[PDB]
Design a protein around this ligand. Structure first.
Ligand SMILES: OC[C@H]1O[C@H](O[C@H]2[C@H](O)[C@@H](O)[C@@H](O)O[C@@H]2CO)[C@H](O)[C@@H](O)[C@@H]1O
Ligand SMILES: OC[C@H]1O[C@H](O[C@H]2[C@H](O)[C@@H](O)[C@@H](O)O[C@@H]2CO)[C@H](O)[C@@H](O)[C@@H]1O
Ligand SMILES: OC[C@H]1O[C@H](O[C@H]2[C@H](O)[C@@H](O)[C@@H](O)O[C@@H]2CO)[C@H](O)[C@@H](O)[C@@H]1O
Ligand SMILES: OC[C@H]1O[C@H](O)[C@H](O)[C@@H](O)[C@@H]1O
Ligand SMILES: OC[C@H]1O[C@H](O)[C@H](O)[C@@H](O)[C@@H]1O
Ligand SMILES: OC[C@H]1O[C@H](O)[C@H](O)[C@@H](O)[C@@H]1O
Ligand code: NA
Ligand code: NA
Lengths: 421, 421, 421
């Protein structure tokens, strides 16, 4: 019941902003740059010492997210590079010791909270800076192939204490936190290796309603999962072909995390953006399969969401002002996907998402005499659903009649169907 | 055997041009105008007297059609209004007696034959001009409610001699004809009322290989149908939700006849055209369901294919030049329609028609291990069909990786999959 | 004087087309694909077996080239992968044994020569197919790291027979060849390893006027260049900061070879194309430094120059139609590069290439009293070169006055200045 209760807002809200920001925004080629260029800590220091986000305005970020129709955010407090954007009492490697001279995470949390957005923190359990985190031979440590680190003396338990402490700070010093998005478990760096059981007990004594993703280890699909296996699953850079279900076939909460371009952190030459049309359609696809979408922005080193990112969000937002009822509080319908688009549903309201006008009337299989009313969501206008003369040979189908050659909305034209009961 | 042999070219070719043209291009408000405005013959004579197409160049027409990827054409030799565009020996109400002084059908037939298109003739079995065709009480004769025409002299046998005679002329005086498209039976005006059996015996005596539509009455869906039931079915202003089959579920040749705007004949104020994207996706749909598409143009009173119609056809043609292998000679795959578009197939070539890029790799159900090569049809380029890292939880899918945020072709990006065996 | 005489056409003509085509158009991610993916010959065979360009029309290629203002071409007869596009008697790995069954180089040579363009052949002295070319341990051979190839029996002399044979075929079987573009020498695979002296002596017995590039090894900048050092230098994917000179500071003939996108071979997802404006400016820059530009196209597997390449070439051509006098037969002026653009020169015609209108009148340092007439090259109109009232304090300058805020031509507005003798 507690599990079911704390996840309600999340399932209802459907659409979030991911935010990846850090020192990596200066090299501006990806958050993994220490790893793929094997950059030791001394060489990353020039980014630490020059990080000065003079145009950082998270109230403008939050207004952008809200206007986009997003209901929650998740921001990187510390990525794999170990740099804390928050004012930790446990390290010096944090934004308050850069020219930023401030807690960037407090500004984020206050701005998003004040717009009515739920406040999420991302926290990398990987740490390429902490000297006790394993390095020589690790799958992706920057110094994984540097023999100067082989058999260097380490106590992983100190890293864990550090990590457990930082999580405590995040859940004590920033008000109410709706999501903790850990990242990620791999090979033997999974489960109890993090003291995950203990981590999660501590978390639920501090903020019992917080939602955790499924990256600490374990198996969220098990009927009786471990305590750290997560409240929701997190497919990445794809939309599952089917909603994610557990081993009994029960729907699990899930959220697809998706980049706007191809990159999480700011990438100075990646302008290969998704269109607002694809963003809308992906959100609708996630909802149509009982899931959420977490759409990422990577702000530049000056602390700006890139203009192309904002242009996309503004148009998505225009669509959501008209069509949001078919997203918020909605889920999958018990019908196969139709030829012409997708369905989402909320009680006795079945939303037909017309992605492809086709030619002539639109055929909704299995719904003849199950629909009491049909209305265009965007304007509340009646849609004619009488079988036209040229379609009388197809009585298993309901027909929607659109008298224009093109749809009124090319992103997605939504028809609200009120089902008989 | 005879039935299968003669339809082969038609099933192969898939894509043709309907041409509605005649006196009704002057009132320019639809070919039913006499009917719906109850115009007597004397009032419509003004169109007969002023019909003089200054710019009728059926060689231009044929080049536009060929360029569009159309393989065949069907032109109106006489419509419901009874005006004949060919030089009939059986009436004076023909194009050679207008100021045009030409046999427009001869010109059409020659010009299209010259470009290598198959030549089809449409003949209205309804006639609102012939004195022996039923008028008073008719479902749609112009004079149906004019009681001054109740009890007018009538020998319907003379209309049948006229009709059977004109079809004999079309099939003797104009070389090899590939399609005869009759239109249409209604109420008691059906089947043997037309002497359909003697008509078709006459037709097959003269040109045994001609294809006939299914509007003479009859039931083409019957296990052994009437001899006049037709070679192909003719759904209209809709693309059937499923391919047309007979009672046993055997697939029938069929063809969807579709307007470019809302009108068959030229409508001077109808600029609500389908886009080239829509046309390409309509044809693909038809082929995916074992069917043809016959797309209409309605020339204006001067003999011109309207410029908006030529614009559409020009772009359709650019697509067909790159992608016609996925159309010509193809039909249905034995696979459900996939989420992202549609399949068409030819031997071991399965064509994936990507109509929505979605987000992430494109998931093809049931095809892992079943595909040997994948290539973009438009340029011959190799496509990567390796399961990406973020998709390993879905082993019953084949994944197509597209490295750009948008498809190369927004109409329809086609992927030629070479199947194993 | 042999050397000077045969290079004059090259220096005069300035602008050429590079064409990279072969089996690598299919995998469509660069001609180095065997090397960067360590592909063995057996897995590349799928491309040999499916190579059948449906739309290879080198007459169309040549018209495109001619209309761009290009005067010569150079085409890959055989790239690093060893596949020959010409009907060699010395190998079976050639285009007449693919489904194409064509000598692609013969058609190229005939098409270009008929349009009046000089005909160039590019030939890779590197060969990743020939069994005697060094593989294990080679800098870039596909099997360079494959243990199976270590210490297998090889005789490099057989590769030199093959290669010298193939060069003799190119120079005997295809008429007059104006350019031979060899590629490339590296580490120990340089100079007399190729038997380059014998190669060049043979070349010059067969076609004494052929121009050769500088990639067989040795030093074209030397005072005493080897016989195989070349007639022209070949900087790549940049425009050198100053014209190429030898050790005595004498100008050498040079050509910058430049891709239209980022790739030589066809790349199916690289649309990052240079604009016509950059193409013009780069040609101008090359000429302004006494060099040539060789601009590359990478045709697709069907043998089409990509649409986007053709768009750039046609807009370049339109500029060359008006302004080509400032390119052909032109070279460097003895002046520093001006603030507003660049100079080219031909006899007493000094062409000022206005790349940047600035604000107000344009200052040409050092030319006050040295210019008789000024004309706009495109329309032959006069240009006012009187010192304006607001510019009398600057008498070491000639001023060009443009009465409009913007230039007539944004690519480059060329003023022809006739010099006082
Ligand atoms: O092709 C000759 C002629 O055709 C049309 O002329 C019409 C005219 O507009 C009507 O008012 C009436 O007189 O019938 C004519 C046809 O005989 C075109 O309008 C005209 O441009 C053209 O010369
Ligand atoms: O199925 C193997 C087949 O591939 C090619 O056939 C093409 C044909 O060239 C096109 O005109 C169109 O019909 O699509 C076909 C399927 O790809 C080869 O040309 C042919 O040799 C081979 O049998
Ligand atoms: O020009 C002949 C033919 O070439 C291409 O056919 C390819 C086909 O796409 C591949 O799957 C494989 O079968 O090799 C064929 C060539 O041998 C074009 O795709 C096709 O349109 C064309 O007719
Ligand atoms: O979900 C996106 C996250 O996971 C990615 O796979 C990387 O670890 C990190 O760059 C990012 O924060
Ligand atoms: O196929 C379209 C045909 O049928 C239509 O229903 C009408 O009879 C006529 O306008 C047209 O020729
Ligand atoms: O000049 C360009 C040539 O050199 C390039 O560096 C590659 O070797 C080859 O793709 C090309 O033919
Ligand atoms: Na209207
Ligand atoms: Na790229």
């Amino acid at each position: 019941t507690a599990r079911e209760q704390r996840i309600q807002w999340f399932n209802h809200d459907r659409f979030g902003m991911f935010i990846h920001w850090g020192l990596y925004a200066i090299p501006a080629r990806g958050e993994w740059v220490r790893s793929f260029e094997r950059i030791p800590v001394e060489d990353y220091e020039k980014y630490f010492n020059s990080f000065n986000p003079v145009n950082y305005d998270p109230k403008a970020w939050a207004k952008a997210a809200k206007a986009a129709g997003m209901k929650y955010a998740v921001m990187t407090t510390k990525h794999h590079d170990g740099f804390c954007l928050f004012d930790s009492a446990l390290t010096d490697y944090k934004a308050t010791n850069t020219p930023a001279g401030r807690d960037l995470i407090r500004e984020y949390a206050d701005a998003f909270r004040a717009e009515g957005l739920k406040v999420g923190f991302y926290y990398s359990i990987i740490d390429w800076h902490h000297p006790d985190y394993p390095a020589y031979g690790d799958r992706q440590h920057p110094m994984r192939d540097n023999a100067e680190f082989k058999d260097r003396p380490q106590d992983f338990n100190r890293y864990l204490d550090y990590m457990h402490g930082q999580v405590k700070e995040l859940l004590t010093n920033y008000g109410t936190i709706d999501v903790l998005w850990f990242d990620f478990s791999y090979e033997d760096m999974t489960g109890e290796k993090w003291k995950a059981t203990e981590l999660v007990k501590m978390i639920r004594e501090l903020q019992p309603n917080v939602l955790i993703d499924n990256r600490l280890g374990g198996n969220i699909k098990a009927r009786e999962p471990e305590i750290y296996a997560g409240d929701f699953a997190s497919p990445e850079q794809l939309l599952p072909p089917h909603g994610i279900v557990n081993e009994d076939g029960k729907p699990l909460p899930w959220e697809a995390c998706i980049t706007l371009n191809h990159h999480w952190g700011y990438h100075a030459h990646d302008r290969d953006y998704k269109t607002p049309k694809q963003v809308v359609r992906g959100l609708v696809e996630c909802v149509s399969k009982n899931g959420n979408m977490l759409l990422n922005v990577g702000p530049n080193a000056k602390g700006e969401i890139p203009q192309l990112s904002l242009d996309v969000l503004g148009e998505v937002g225009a669509w959501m002002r008209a069509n949001g009822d078919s997203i918020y509080g909605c889920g999958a319908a018990a019908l196969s996907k139709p030829e012409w688009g997708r369905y989402t549903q909320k009680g006795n309201k079945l939303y037909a998402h017309i992605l492809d006008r086709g030619i002539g009337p639109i055929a909704l299989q299995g719904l003849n005499g199950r629909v009491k009313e049909a209305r265009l969501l965007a304007d509340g206008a009646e849609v004619n659903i009488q079988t036209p003369w040229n379609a009388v040979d197809y009585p298993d189908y309901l027909f929607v009649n659109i008298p224009t050659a093109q749809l009124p909305d090319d992103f997605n034209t939504v028809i609200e169907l009120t089902l008989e009961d």
